Design a protein around this ligand. Structure first.
Ligand SMILES: CCCCCCCCO[C@@H]1O[C@H](CO)[C@@H](O)[C@H](O)[C@H]1O
Ligand SMILES: CCCCCCCCO[C@@H]1O[C@H](CO)[C@@H](O)[C@H](O)[C@H]1O
Ligand SMILES: CCCCCCCCO[C@@H]1O[C@H](CO)[C@@H](O)[C@H](O)[C@H]1O
Ligand SMILES: CCCCCCCCO[C@@H]1O[C@H](CO)[C@@H](O)[C@H](O)[C@H]1O
Ligand SMILES: CCCCCCCCO[C@@H]1O[C@H](CO)[C@@H](O)[C@H](O)[C@H]1O
Ligand SMILES: CCCCCCCCO[C@@H]1O[C@H](CO)[C@@H](O)[C@H](O)[C@H]1O
Ligand SMILES: CCCCCCCCO[C@@H]1O[C@H](CO)[C@@H](O)[C@H](O)[C@H]1O
Ligand SMILES: CCCCCCCCO[C@@H]1O[C@H](CO)[C@@H](O)[C@H](O)[C@H]1O
Lengths: 254, 254, 254, 254
């Protein structure tokens, strides 16, 4: 039942953002030690749990990019596409609000101590707690390339790990492996654009940060071209490229 | 046989606290490098082993919050509720004493070096070695919200990961996954209240620290409202909310 | 079909180098915190994913040393040996180029800041981002011994973990375990020669670095005897020693 | 065949020490970043691989304490006890020599730089690279208690994780879990005595260090009572206590 699937997607995406934004809030305003890998493995495993929670019901897309790609290449009911995407974005939204709710004090005490004006260009660093931003040394197009490539790999391997005709089936191991995959993508490519590769994972929380006092920079990142467009469309394009790539170069030869 | 189940719960909870309090003693008085994630993964995996050890006998609750919730929502024998809870709290108690026994010297040598008066408000930091305390920037109610929310998630996902009607069954993977789940909750929400979410895990060891020279602050944490009430009731309320939430929003649609 | 297997090997090796060279680029020019173990576990797990992706098609050698050894001891079609090796080296090549493409800016901005002349003896450190080099305290022969021994162990355990007549079969766990194995070899022996143990993993990326401005030092490492010979032949010799060792000391007694 | 089992034990124990002593050599003389947990997880997983390699043949004791305990409580052929123990100690010996062989230069260059006289009381720190020593704040008896307790837990859980009548059988997961168990014991109790809990793991390598220039301190640790007695007998006593404890408190109720 579509209502029960939307609920699952809502919770799954929210669970996913709870752990992800959470560990990043601990790093930013709680002063917890975290390396590029640890942050990546936490996000990865968080997504793994999200999957174990909802796969049996919704099928666990938990990513607009994944939903659009499954529709175009895995015969996913198009009537289910928008309902899913609205659930995904809504859960990420609420989850971000929940993480902020619990860390509320640390955000303010940190900004006061370090004289950070929320909403200013310098507050993008803490805004990073919720959504992704581009590394200082790269521009809009370079950043678009990154999200595109990595999401392609994400989609491609998600299919590979779930393709029962490819090598020994993984069974209950599938979700976990999808987690570690996300982990390594986040550790190898993360420093460039924050390995968003999920429109819902980035837009929802960005909208939240926008309401919470970060204003326009939550969307622009303090740049000329509004950055939110990259985590929005880059993942979608790449998820399609990846899904196509698998069916052509690997599936076709199974 | 109830006596054999209580023994299992006693050992399981103790095993769990052995690893948990242990890695935190190494961090505090042994000077070992540990980040927020490592401390979390150790606790998580420690609980995973505890489960593998006792699941076959007691069913591995190892948490008063989990026992009360299983009683109210999983048809758990109420006659078994109190015997279990007393075993859980007793094992955590003894385990804490055991960890202190082995680290005895490091505690004293550390307090002498850093001129720390055990029992004083400043000794709460080392008391943290055994039980949980609230982050400096939050109060009693904020802290209650945290334990409540997270334990709800703990219970909810524990059911999800063990619900054989939800997606592919995890089989022998269940305990491990429950461990990583605990890991990510500890890494995303830990800095706020020490991710207690287990009345026995906190009260028992607090009682121990109280006897060992930490006195009243072991319970108060050096605050106006006695802090031990949060890890005591917050987890119980949340475990019920979580258990309810799963049966309603997910189980109902399986 | 050999064409589909070469494609799989190309992608597998490239996937493997994407994650590996990637996390090392983040460490070198992105300033991400990574310890010897984290770098090792990322490489390890990256190789694990590579396997899950191609095992069903090519058989997932993803290593010239492994291919030559399977030919000589596992009855691998010799007609398939060279096609495989050219695919492996080509994927590692392209993958390295891809990682450089995405990190392009960080490389230049880093070299400008730290006044590093690409191609100079001092730039070998960043060249390390792609291929392996010998620790300052050891020479050509010592370095050859290291790659030789470790690859022997790599091959030996790869066979052990996939030998269904050895203990309980691992099933879908095999790849993952091969990953952790690679992880521990990288953490225990890594600081000596960068745990290359894969001719394709080192030569391809070295050739890339050579074209990208590192010139001759990409091959020499800034030493008297051209270093590329060690990751080239050392792994091959060892993979044979390891494969032999297993069949003799372990397989023979199963 | 007993000869093939001794060979397996020899290699298994050696594999185990290769990874363990190796990561500790990287930490000491290679300057690699490693926290208490990482060192522990590497040892743990190293032992996990050792098991996967030999379980099918020898049964993978790889520990004199485990062999004596299996004999007394798991009906292990006593004729096989000494042959096993001599193999275990011999492999650990050779493995240590192998790790020193590969890290040879780093040991000398480090000692010269930091003006460390091998064999002196101050060189025990580097000797620690091979075997275990007691934390500065504890004595012989305190140290004996630690090894005793922890090995008991090691044995107890090894039985629990392999006891097919206890909860769902772990199957191919058993070795890995035994690894993480070792990991958490090393992270929670490691700083006290180096979590030896394996006579062969400590005596063999100590004998090696003794020959390599560390002399008498390799055995004494620079203390009044020769320290090697603790990792020698403490583990054996505890392994028996643990094995007994499981059969009584858990097995009896299955
Ligand atoms: C779940 C519904 C959440 C709705 C958005 C709540 C955002 C609360 O966030 C608040 O936003 C204010 C407006 O910028 C700021 O002034 C406050 O500092 C900030 O705490
Ligand atoms: C499902 C997601 C659909 C996103 C549609 C585009 C939303 C763009 O959002 C807009 O961005 C502007 C530029 O910074 C801001 O000025 C506006 O306040 C904001 O509403
Ligand atoms: C398993 C039974 C354990 C009973 C509690 C033992 C506590 C030992 O702890 C001791 O407590 C004393 C009283 O405050 C302090 O003076 C000592 O410093 C402390 O070591
Ligand atoms: C199963 C757990 C039941 C706990 C019941 C409440 C125990 C409260 O404990 C009490 O807290 C007081 C306040 O700091 C102290 O003054 C007392 O010494 C202490 O006994
Ligand atoms: C996939 C095909 C890739 C072909 C090699 C591209 C290498 C681009 O690398 C470029 O090499 C130049 C020559 O040294 C240097 O001057 C530039 O700094 C460097 O960016
Ligand atoms: C499949 C891999 C085959 C490798 C064959 C040897 C390639 C050696 O490569 C050569 O190394 C020389 C020494 O630095 C350089 O001067 C040359 O430019 C380079 O082409
Ligand atoms: C596998 C057989 C190994 C036998 C032991 C080899 C030990 C080599 O070790 C050597 O020992 C010498 C004697 O103390 C020292 O002088 C050297 O510094 C040391 O390198
Ligand atoms: C299977 C292991 C049996 C160990 C038997 C005891 C070996 C003790 O070893 C001895 O220790 C002495 C004290 O430091 C040294 O003086 C001797 O050189 C050394 O041989």
């Amino acid at each position: 039942t579509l209502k029960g699937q939307c609920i699952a997607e809502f919770l799954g995406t929210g669970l996913l953002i709870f752990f992800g934004v959470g560990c990043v809030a601990a790093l930013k305003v709680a002063g917890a030690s975290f390396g590029q890998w640890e942050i990546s493995v936490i996000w990865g495993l968080g997504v793994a749990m999200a999957i174990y929670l909802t796969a049996g019901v919704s099928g666990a897309h938990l990513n607009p990019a994944v939903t659009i790609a499954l529709w175009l290449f895995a015969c996913f009911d198009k009537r289910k596409v928008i309902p899913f995407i609205v659930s995904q974005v809504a859960g990420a939204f609420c989850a971000a609000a929940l993480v902020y709710g619990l860390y509320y004090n640390l955000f303010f005490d940190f900004e006061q101590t370090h004289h950070i004006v929320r909403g200013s260009v310098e507050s993008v660093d803490l805004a990073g707690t919720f959504s992704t931003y581009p590394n200082p040394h790269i521009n809009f197009v370079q950043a678009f390339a990154v999200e595109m490539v990595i999401t392609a790999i994400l989609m491609g391997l998600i299919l590979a790990l779930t393709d029962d005709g490819n090598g020994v089936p993984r069974g209950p191991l599938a979700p976990l492996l999808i987690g570690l995959l996300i982990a390594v993508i986040g550790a190898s490519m993360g420093p460039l654009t924050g390995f968003a590769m999920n429109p819902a994972r980035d837009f929802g929380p960005k909208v939240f940060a926008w309401l919470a006092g970060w204003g326009n920079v939550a969307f622009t990142g303090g740049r000329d071209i509004p950055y939110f467009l990259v985590p929005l469309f880059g993942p979608i394009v790449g998820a399609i490229v990846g899904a196509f790539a698998y069916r052509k170069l690997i599936g076709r030869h199974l």
